[PDB]
Amino acid sequence: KVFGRCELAAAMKRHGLDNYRGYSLGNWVCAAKFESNFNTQATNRNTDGSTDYGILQINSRWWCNDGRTPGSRNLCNIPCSALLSSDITASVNCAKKIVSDGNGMNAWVAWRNRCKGTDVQAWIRGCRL
Ligand SMILES: [Cl-]
Ligand SMILES: [Cl-]
Ligand SMILES: [Cl-]
Ligand SMILES: [Cl-]
Ligand code: NA
Ligand SMILES: [Pt+2]
């Protein structure tokens, strides 16, 4: 599923991401934009052989099991394929764990490079939330 910008903000709100660990909804929308372009099916291989999965590009190196990332952890206790569902619950639950782990949203390289410090409110501008 390819979300619309306000559709995704509403889904993230509904699953309690809005202001989670102090990050406004627009941070999370912006991160999704630049990670996945709002596409729940997005997958990208990393140079280290890990893969990033879903709307938030959660990495098999630490967070989900894909059975092909040697030496990796599965700290969200889920198959990476659960992170590609049209329903964002699993991605949200896992993102909550990631963002709680000490480095906040900087874990998302696209957030750090393209969202951090910008007018992230623009991302939920005009949305009926
Ligand atoms: Cl915001
Ligand atoms: Cl593995
Ligand atoms: Cl959803
Ligand atoms: Cl923080
Ligand atoms: Na893994
Ligand atoms: Pt939820």
Residue 66 sits in a domain of what CATH number? 1.10.530.10
Residues 7, 18, 48, 52: which is the catalytic one?
A: 52
Q: Does the CA dihedral 40-15-74-65 come out positive or negative?
A: negative
Domain limits at 76? 1-129
Distance 112 CA to ligand 5 centre (A): 23
CB proximity list for 41: less than 8 A, separation 6 or greater: 1, 54, 84
Distance 69 CA to ligand 6 centre (A): 28
Q: Is 119 annotated as a binding residue?
A: no
Domain count, the chain: 1
Give the CA count within 13 Å in the CB-facing half-sphere of 37: 3
**DSSP state for residue 107 in the 8-state scheme:** G
- Extract the tokens encoding 21: 């660990």
- Extract the tokens encoding 3: 């979300």
Amino acid residing at 32: A
Q: Is 18 a catalytic residue?
A: no
Tell me the ligand closest to 125's alpha carbon: 1
